[PDB]
Amino acid sequence: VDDVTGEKVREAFEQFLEDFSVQSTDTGEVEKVYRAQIEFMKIYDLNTIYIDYQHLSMRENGALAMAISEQYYRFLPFLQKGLRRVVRKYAPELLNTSPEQTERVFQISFFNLPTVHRIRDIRSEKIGSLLSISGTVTRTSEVRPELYKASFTCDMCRAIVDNVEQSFKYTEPTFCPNPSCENRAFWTLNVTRSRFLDWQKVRIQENANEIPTGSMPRTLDVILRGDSVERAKPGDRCKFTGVEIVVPDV
Amino acid sequence: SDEINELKEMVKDEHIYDKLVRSIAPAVFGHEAVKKGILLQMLGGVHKSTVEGIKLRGDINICVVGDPSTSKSQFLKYVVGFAPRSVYTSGKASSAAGLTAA
Amino acid sequence: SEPLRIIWGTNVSIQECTTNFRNFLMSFKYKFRKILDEREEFINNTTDEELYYIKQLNEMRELGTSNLNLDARNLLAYKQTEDLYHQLLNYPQEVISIMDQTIKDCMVSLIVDNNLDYDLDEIETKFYKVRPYNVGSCKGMRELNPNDIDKLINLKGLVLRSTPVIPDMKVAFFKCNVCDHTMAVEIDRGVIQEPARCERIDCNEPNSMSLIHNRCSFADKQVIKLQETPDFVPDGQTPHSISLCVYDELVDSCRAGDRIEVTGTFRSIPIRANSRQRVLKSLYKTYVDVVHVKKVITDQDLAKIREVAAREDLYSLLARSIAPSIYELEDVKKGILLQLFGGTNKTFTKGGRYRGDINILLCGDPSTSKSQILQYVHKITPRGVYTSGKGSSAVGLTAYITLVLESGALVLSDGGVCCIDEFDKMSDSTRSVLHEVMEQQTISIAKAGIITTLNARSSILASANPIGSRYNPNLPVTENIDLPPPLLSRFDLVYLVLDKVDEKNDRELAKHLTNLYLEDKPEHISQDDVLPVEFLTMYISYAKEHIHPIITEAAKTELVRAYVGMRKMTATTRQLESMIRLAEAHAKMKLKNVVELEDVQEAVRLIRSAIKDYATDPKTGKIDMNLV
Amino acid sequence: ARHSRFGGLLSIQTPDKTRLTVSGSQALVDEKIALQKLDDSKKWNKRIIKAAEG
DNA sequence: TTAGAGAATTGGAGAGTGTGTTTTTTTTTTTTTTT
DNA sequence: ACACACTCTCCAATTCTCTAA
Ligand SMILES: Nc1ncnc2c1ncn2[C@@H]1O[C@H](COP(=O)(O)OP(=O)(O)NP(=O)(O)O)[C@@H](O)[C@H]1O
Ligand SMILES: [Mg+2]
Ligand SMILES: [Zn+2]
Ligand SMILES: [Zn+2]
């Protein structure tokens, strides 16, 4: 079964990356800034791309921006698929990270959203939407490796399982793929073939000047990944953007 | 570029020192001596060490004593409202653990 | 004839409840309620004939809002719903649902029948909810019994604390691991109805579907802790508390120290012995499931307020009406009235913010009725606290580490008045806490694991007796009061009240107090003309919200002159600011937008009168008792 | 409109005075939904038959 | 064209087996001995 | 010993196929 909205969003975001076609800061000449940003990334072997929400707002009567805003968690994989093709088209040197080289895990980033919420304004109706938040940092965790994609091999026979997907808990295969063996136990995680990510936990509390009458400040836990770990510092004031999520009792 | 131009323009002035002293804590009437002291603390001295490895302190500590209604807390309020790295604490409502580390 | 729908275990038919409530909703008019009320004479024939709920529904449509209040007495006024009133109390879960689906259908019917421009899809998308209230007599928290389970209840109390918002699941989302088919499933009775096999025809496989947490749908839940009011506690015992569960609209409504009345179903549930197994305990947990919360305008109100403000005797009228049964003490009453109004709050782009609040100290002889006055202020103010000197610690008065932070008296009292009695009994250690809160109206904290600053826009009203416990005329006034100068400098008004013997005074006082015992429950009151407490509260509240006086140049000249007069001779710089603040409070009380010469002169006069300055020896600082 | 644990209980009486029980708040008002929800609880489905390869 | 006799495939009833469980601060109110 | 999770096994319900009236 296939989601048509995802494919149409994918190949519309593709066209935005191709031909946003803003004119120069000094002259009436088309500049194509996002293609230039891809070239810049190629020059410096970067892994993240920044997009302006105002540029997306004016595109195609705003429907694309609405779909990205209200259903970010559904559409984020399709946005990744859309960007991969464009980088292949104009800068295939960026697709890889001598023996063979694994693929680059690109990160899309957004800024200049219309409004900033307080920690006190987080409510369950907004789960999975795109938001921006501000507060004072009070604690930070050390950087830890998070398992992103896994690969296992069987003890009772020479067989391998690859690209197993994790979500919130450490997860392992359901069968031995070789039908000559039935053992489900004694898997081991191949640290060379599997892939990890950088992960950091930080904790924030409300701005003192914003607290309402007779009340006290609430707090929140925030997750940082990739090239943004250790950017935050205790006692500083920061502004964040991302999506709010819900975490189980593992 | 415009920031550099503005900074150069005020750097060139003959009367810069007096204007700087006069611009600390605008709401407080008089007490130019304390304002001058606050400016010099904010700028600070030069940190250094000797061949022996001993360090020489490069910064300035200040204390203000006064009888009531002398507006002495306004200086602390201005400093904590202005200086990029600063914290305000009350001697009654704080602990040694909360002051250093816990 | 046909199958029927029946509330389980009742033989009540849903058709009758639906039709009766529809008829009530589309034909009730306010005049019927006045028939149940004491007189037909009250009726305004023009207004009271109107279809009240149709008017409300039109407003809901055009204001874009989703909830309808309903006081249950109207169900008794209309003849067709006299029995529905009882059925509501006995079967709330079913009856309330019936009412909801009635209101939504009526809203649709209005736009399609009156053929209006509004989007039908928009109205179909929304949820509409009734919120019944004023159901009957309130019930004591300890007197709820196991025969009240699942019936509607009404409670009064005070709010202790609220937990943060909890996400509550409402719809589950499944996805097939092999073929990527998806299904949305409805949650009822807390159990997820997971499919046995993947429902796509060609992928009919077992264990094939799986849950996706962050594509589910959730709703807000919160728990509020309500405490028993002292009016109901048994003799020689301490108050109890009960927990309220609240959802969606009402979630963040209420703060610590609030005083409320609620309405909700009284529920009970089992609890498990361990998290591994289905074993339940024999005792059941109990709680309340609220559907409405209430705190304990018209052109006629504005007309009354403007007309009262035009009276010549207004200042004396308001002052003698805050505490009607207390004899004389007019200057004390006046100062307290100006504390109630307050100054104006000011904030600059730079140079800070300046307090509008007034601090008052009452000091003098025993039996002078100081503490009796504190009772009136504590009950008049919308928010506030009463406490005693030996009852208070430094932590309890401000804030408490518990890792979480918790509120004390001055924080609960924010925006209100904090009454402190036996102020002379608390230690110098505890009193030193008040310096920062009175000067700045903020509380700074720096302890293990917590460092922050909190707001405290709190007015202090204090009561004390002098050193030696009776005022000694052989010592100067500052030595009789005996507070240290850094703390005595922070009060806007300081009053001396003295137990001076005089036959003229004593006969009047004796006649006043003995007159209260001529009746069982007295109707007698000290004066012919006083305002009711409700209307007086309305006046003060409106004047606080709408009026914001400014300094006139004339007022500036008089303030400078007056300060130099008190100064040249001790008056500190705070005497100037407190004069400004008192003059502003006086201006609000007349509903003026400007401070004038008259207001400045009243502020000066009241300061001179409070500390008996005219009777003070200007050089020795002693008071001539003969001049009092 | 209201949450998943608020729900009351419904009874439906047939001809010949026999009664059934269903839960949830929408069943109180919508008989079509109640009738459909009633049959949906029942466990069995008949198992089924199935052309091309190579 | 119906139907009835024989063979093959599948479901789940239900019987069986193994398993897990009890159980150094830091902050704040109060009493007591010590200078 | 008392609820649970998981495995094993047998038996009959079911549909498919062939034959003759
Ligand atoms: N002017 C008055 N009007 C009304 N009651 C009065 C007056 N003067 C004294 N009383 C009565 O005398 C008693 C005063 O008690 P109280 O309010 O505690 O006075 P106080 O100033 O707080 N004295 P103390 O607590 O000893 O410092 C109460 O019963 C009052 O009703
Ligand atoms: Mg008293
Ligand atoms: Zn194997
Ligand atoms: Zn499937």
Side-chain angles (χ1 to χ4, degrees):
Chain A
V1 178
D2 297 287
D3 193 342
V4 177
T5 63
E7 301 298 348
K8 290 194 185 302
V9 167
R10 171 193 185 180
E11 303 196 344
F13 180 64
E14 182 186 298
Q15 296 170 62
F16 167 86
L17 287 176
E18 280 276 34
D19 294 312
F20 174 58
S21 61
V22 67
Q23 292 197 128
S24 171
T25 306
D26 56 11
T27 47
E29 67 191 7
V30 176
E31 195 156 37
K32 302 202 180 189
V33 294
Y34 292 109
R35 193 183 288 175
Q37 192 181 160
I38 291 165
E39 189 67 32
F40 191 96
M41 291 171 60
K42 162 173 165 289
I43 289 159
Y44 300 107
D45 301 334
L46 304 179
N47 64 5
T48 186
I49 187 175
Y50 295 90
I51 302 183
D52 188 330
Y53 189 79
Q54 295 197 340
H55 295 177
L56 239 168
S57 299
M58 61 185 76
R59 182 66 186 200
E60 289 166 31
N61 200 32
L64 179 57
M66 182 184 71
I68 291 166
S69 171
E70 306 314 281
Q71 299 187 351
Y72 190 102
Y73 191 90
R74 172 155 77 146
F75 291 123
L76 179 64
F78 290 104
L79 267 48
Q80 289 278 18
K81 283 180 177 178
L83 177 137
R84 281 291 305 265
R85 185 177 291 158
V86 173
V87 178
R88 179 197 290 269
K89 183 172 176 180
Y90 293 100
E93 297 179 18
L94 278 167
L95 262 57
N96 302 92
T97 48
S98 300
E100 310 302 339
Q101 293 156 240
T102 57
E103 301 197 321
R104 189 177 303 260
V105 280
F106 292 91
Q107 180 200 56
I108 306 102
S109 312
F110 300 87
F111 66 101
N112 211 113
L113 281 160
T115 187
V116 174
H117 299 158
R118 308 165 299 180
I119 293 161
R120 186 173 297 269
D121 302 320
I122 289 177
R123 304 291 294 266
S124 62
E125 65 182 332
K126 282 177 169 69
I127 283 168
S129 66
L130 176 61
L131 306 169
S132 69
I133 275 151
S134 181
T136 56
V137 178
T138 176
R139 285 186 182 176
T140 63
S141 194
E142 64 183 51
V143 186
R144 307 181 181 277
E146 188 204 335
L147 179 62
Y148 178 64
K149 289 174 182 279
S151 58
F152 305 90
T153 180
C154 189
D155 183 53
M156 188 60 185
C157 71
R158 302 292 74 76
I160 286 173
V161 186
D162 209 342
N163 295 308
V164 179
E165 292 290 344
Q166 298 298 305
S167 76
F168 293 109
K169 80 182 195 295
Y170 171 63
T171 299
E172 300 187 324
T174 62
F175 52 71
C176 180
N178 182 3
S180 191
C181 170
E182 296 295 336
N183 167 60
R184 269 68 174 179
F186 307 110
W187 293 111
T188 56
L189 183 275
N190 186 304
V191 171
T192 304
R193 288 173 174 251
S194 58
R195 299 193 68 175
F196 295 83
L197 286 172
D198 292 311
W199 179 101
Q200 187 183 34
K201 169 75 87 73
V202 309
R203 186 168 175 83
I204 60 177
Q205 70 179 5
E206 290 175 280
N207 295 323
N209 60 299
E210 181 51 31
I211 300 167
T213 70
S215 195
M216 290 187 153
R218 291 182 181 166
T219 70
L220 181 69
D221 278 16
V222 182
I223 308 300
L224 299 174
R225 297 210 293 192
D227 287 48
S228 62
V229 300
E230 283 284 8
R231 197 79 64 151
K233 188 175 182 169
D236 197 14
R237 270 192 180 210
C238 299
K239 175 158 57 181
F240 299 81
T241 177
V243 303
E244 58 161 301
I245 64 174
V246 137
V247 179
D249 300 326
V250 172
Chain B
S1 56
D2 57 334
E3 283 167 0
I4 289 161
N5 295 343
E6 186 182 61
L7 179 59
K8 186 167 73 74
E9 285 161 14
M10 70 179 288
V11 161
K12 201 71 172 179
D13 192 356
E14 174 58 23
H15 300 283
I16 183 58
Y17 181 78
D18 295 303
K19 291 178 179 179
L20 289 168
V21 173
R22 187 178 300 139
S23 200
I24 300 296
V28 177
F29 181 85
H31 304 292
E32 280 81 355
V34 172
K35 295 176 180 180
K36 188 181 292 185
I38 283 167
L39 180 66
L40 296 182
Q41 183 181 46
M42 203 158 285
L43 287 163
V46 179
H47 173 77
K48 59 184 83 70
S49 63
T50 179
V51 171
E52 195 59 58
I54 290 163
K55 294 179 180 178
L56 303 172
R57 220 190 79 212
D59 51 26
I60 296 154
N61 292 323
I62 296 183
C63 173
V64 181
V65 180
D67 79 338
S69 78
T70 47
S71 78
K72 63 193 178 183
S73 288
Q74 297 293 351
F75 301 125
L76 310 195
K77 215 72 173 70
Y78 179 81
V79 165
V80 79
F82 183 87
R85 295 300 303 193
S86 57
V87 181
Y88 177 83
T89 293
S90 177
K92 181 56 178 169
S94 54
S95 71
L99 281 153
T100 56
Chain C
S1 297
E2 292 184 327
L4 294 178
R5 280 175 278 130
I6 300 296
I7 298 173
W8 186 88
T10 69
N11 296 339
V12 169
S13 179
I14 294 182
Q15 289 285 8
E16 183 176 1
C17 299
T18 306
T19 50
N20 292 341
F21 186 56
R22 184 188 293 275
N23 288 2
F24 167 82
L25 191 64
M26 298 190 78
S27 71
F28 176 87
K29 52 186 179 178
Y30 204 92
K31 190 183 186 187
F32 295 126
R33 178 61 174 280
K34 290 187 178 289
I35 305 304
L36 269 64
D37 203 357
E38 300 302 330
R39 307 190 195 189
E40 298 85 350
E41 303 186 338
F42 304 149
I43 291 163
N44 290 116
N45 187 70
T46 54
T47 49
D48 306 350
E49 289 281 355
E50 293 171 18
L51 293 181
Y52 182 88
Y53 291 105
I54 296 297
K55 197 176 186 179
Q56 291 271 9
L57 263 61
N58 287 330
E59 290 173 17
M60 286 176 68
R61 178 186 65 244
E62 290 174 19
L63 280 52
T65 182
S66 163
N67 304 78
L68 173 59
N69 296 350
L70 167 57
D71 47 325
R73 279 184 163 277
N74 292 348
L75 296 164
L76 292 169
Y78 188 65
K79 290 180 181 179
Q80 304 184 332
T81 51
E82 291 180 333
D83 53 359
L84 182 59
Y85 171 83
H86 292 283
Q87 284 164 96
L88 170 62
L89 277 77
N90 296 345
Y91 308 102
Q93 301 156 250
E94 290 84 352
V95 171
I96 289 173
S97 301
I98 291 161
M99 291 172 174
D100 292 339
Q101 281 283 3
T102 307
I103 290 158
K104 182 167 178 172
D105 181 64
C106 186
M107 284 278 274
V108 167
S109 81
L110 284 171
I111 63 152
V112 301
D113 182 18
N114 206 9
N115 55 90
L116 303 171
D117 297 349
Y118 301 94
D119 290 334
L120 180 58
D121 297 285
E122 173 59 18
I123 296 184
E124 283 196 46
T125 303
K126 266 172 163 55
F127 304 115
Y128 293 95
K129 300 181 185 178
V130 70
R131 290 207 262 76
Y133 80 112
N134 188 230
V135 66
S137 302
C138 60
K139 293 171 181 287
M141 186 180 301
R142 298 176 193 241
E143 304 188 30
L144 302 173
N145 291 327
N147 62 296
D148 299 315
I149 291 168
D150 299 335
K151 296 185 175 70
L152 277 191
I153 294 295
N154 175 287
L155 296 176
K156 299 175 184 285
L158 176 138
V159 178
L160 289 171
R161 55 180 178 272
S162 306
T163 55
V165 60
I166 297 174
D168 186 41
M169 185 174 283
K170 194 169 66 176
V171 177
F173 191 100
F174 293 100
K175 185 171 186 273
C176 180
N177 295 112
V178 68
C179 81
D180 300 300
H181 171 67
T182 55
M183 288 204 300
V185 170
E186 179 71 2
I187 303 302
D188 46 16
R189 312 184 83 157
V191 66
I192 306 167
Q193 187 40 260
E194 185 181 337
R197 304 175 73 98
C198 175
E199 293 293 353
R200 191 178 81 86
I201 306 302
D202 300 84
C203 184
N204 179 20
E205 298 198 343
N207 308 344
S208 187
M209 301 296 279
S210 62
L211 175 66
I212 297 182
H213 308 292
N214 281 274
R215 290 195 63 194
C216 300
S217 184
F218 296 83
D220 295 331
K221 177 177 180 179
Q222 172 169 130
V223 184
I224 299 177
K225 194 83 167 184
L226 185 80
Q227 196 183 61
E228 182 175 36
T229 182
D231 192 30
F232 305 148
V233 182
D235 302 329
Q237 293 200 40
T238 178
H240 282 335
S241 57
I242 192 164
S243 60
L244 316 176
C245 278
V246 57
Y247 299 87
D248 300 335
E249 176 197 22
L250 293 158
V251 163
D252 195 0
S253 306
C254 298
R255 286 174 290 129
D258 290 2
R259 190 174 295 106
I260 59 180
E261 178 176 316
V262 307
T263 288
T265 306
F266 169 71
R267 279 179 167 274
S268 66
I269 52 174
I271 54 176
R272 292 183 173 200
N274 64 69
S275 69
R276 306 186 305 268
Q277 289 185 264
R278 297 180 291 157
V279 177
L280 301 177
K281 295 203 296 184
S282 184
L283 273 291
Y284 271 39
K285 164 181 170 184
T286 65
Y287 69 101
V288 173
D289 175 11
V290 294
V291 306
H292 184 251
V293 176
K294 176 179 174 186
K295 308 298 189 177
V296 296
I297 296 297
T298 73
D299 60 356
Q300 303 305 287
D301 305 317
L302 182 58
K304 284 281 186 178
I305 284 167
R306 291 284 175 187
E307 201 279 324
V308 161
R311 284 182 62 159
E312 290 199 335
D313 61 349
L314 178 65
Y315 189 16
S316 72
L317 173 63
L318 293 165
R320 80 195 180 211
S321 189
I322 75 175
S325 190
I326 301 300
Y327 175 86
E328 287 195 50
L329 298 174
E330 193 173 47
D331 290 44
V332 176
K333 289 167 174 166
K334 282 178 170 177
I336 290 167
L337 182 67
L338 297 180
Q339 179 184 53
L340 294 185
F341 280 97
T344 64
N345 300 317
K346 309 184 198 295
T347 65
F348 306 168
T349 54
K350 61 219 74 180
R353 54 174 166 166
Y354 294 81
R355 87 167 191 250
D357 295 335
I358 306 187
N359 295 322
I360 299 186
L361 176 60
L362 306 178
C363 185
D365 288 331
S367 192
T368 316
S369 79
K370 302 182 304 299
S371 192
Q372 282 294 0
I373 288 171
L374 270 67
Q375 311 311 303
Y376 289 94
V377 177
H378 178 250
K379 291 181 179 184
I380 288 288
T381 185
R383 204 178 195 89
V385 179
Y386 177 93
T387 194
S388 298
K390 276 284 161 189
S392 304
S393 65
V395 162
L397 209 66
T398 50
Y400 161 52
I401 299 288
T402 198
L403 187 70
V404 170
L405 194 67
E406 182 55 78
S407 58
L410 293 160
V411 173
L412 293 169
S413 180
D414 188 24
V417 175
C418 182
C419 316
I420 306 178
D421 212 346
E422 304 303 339
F423 193 95
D424 57 295
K425 276 58 169 192
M426 48 165 67
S427 60
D428 292 334
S429 176
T430 301
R431 275 184 277 95
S432 296
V433 171
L434 298 173
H435 289 42
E436 178 184 345
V437 187
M438 293 170 78
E439 172 53 33
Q440 299 188 39
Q441 300 212 303
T442 60
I443 297 157
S444 65
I445 294 165
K447 294 176 179 181
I450 295 187
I451 175 166
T452 192
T453 60
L454 309 173
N455 289 289
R457 295 146 287 221
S458 304
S459 308
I460 294 184
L461 172 57
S463 156
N465 294 351
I467 188 64
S469 194
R470 197 172 186 83
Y471 188 87
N472 190 347
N474 294 335
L475 288 177
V477 49
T478 185
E479 192 151 20
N480 269 287
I481 293 165
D482 201 31
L483 293 177
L487 180 52
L488 183 57
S489 179
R490 285 168 156 77
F491 287 91
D492 296 277
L493 289 171
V494 175
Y495 283 88
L496 296 182
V497 294
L498 302 172
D499 182 16
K500 188 69 170 70
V501 173
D502 161 42
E503 54 272 14
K504 301 294 188 183
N505 170 87
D506 295 351
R507 286 201 308 118
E508 295 298 333
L509 206 180
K511 285 174 65 175
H512 174 65
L513 278 173
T514 53
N515 284 351
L516 284 172
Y517 292 91
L518 294 170
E519 298 185 320
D520 52 356
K521 298 294 184 178
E523 303 299 334
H524 192 273
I525 192 162
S526 71
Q527 189 62 48
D528 57 355
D529 188 9
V530 302
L531 297 169
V533 173
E534 295 291 338
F535 176 75
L536 184 56
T537 305
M538 284 214 303
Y539 189 105
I540 287 159
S541 186
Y542 163 81
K544 284 188 77 175
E545 290 291 341
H546 281 65
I547 307 301
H548 295 90
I550 60 171
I551 293 177
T552 313
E553 293 177 43
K556 155 171 170 179
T557 61
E558 184 73 335
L559 282 159
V560 172
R561 188 183 74 88
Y563 174 71
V564 171
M566 295 196 297
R567 183 71 160 168
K568 182 165 60 175
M569 297 295 292
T570 305
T572 72
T573 297
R574 280 188 175 118
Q575 268 66 28
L576 176 56
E577 297 210 290
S578 51
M579 277 187 297
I580 291 158
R581 182 155 48 239
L582 275 160
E584 286 182 356
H586 187 272
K588 296 166 85 174
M589 178 267 292
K590 285 187 164 191
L591 307 185
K592 296 195 296 184
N593 283 299
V594 291
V595 173
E596 289 175 293
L597 180 61
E598 62 195 32
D599 311 291
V600 172
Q601 288 178 349
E602 281 290 5
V604 172
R605 181 266 285 247
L606 204 69
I607 292 163
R608 303 296 289 279
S609 185
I611 196 153
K612 231 73 179 184
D613 185 49
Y614 51 86
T616 304
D617 187 324
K619 194 177 182 73
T620 59
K622 298 173 186 173
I623 294 167
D624 185 4
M625 300 295 286
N626 300 273
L627 305 178
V628 176
Chain D
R2 285 176 152 108
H3 58 80
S4 61
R5 287 184 170 101
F6 188 85
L9 289 172
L10 177 60
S11 185
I12 300 174
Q13 70 183 29
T14 58
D16 198 6
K17 297 194 175 181
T18 305
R19 280 180 176 180
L20 299 309
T21 59
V22 299
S23 60
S25 50
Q26 283 300 124
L28 293 169
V29 59
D30 286 335
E31 290 167 21
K32 289 75 168 181
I33 295 179
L35 296 154
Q36 202 108 349
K37 186 179 179 78
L38 172 58
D39 212 45
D40 201 14
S41 166
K42 300 173 188 169
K43 284 178 160 68
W44 149 279
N45 294 59
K46 190 172 171 63
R47 71 182 318 298
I48 302 299
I49 292 145
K50 295 180 180 177
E53 212 84 86

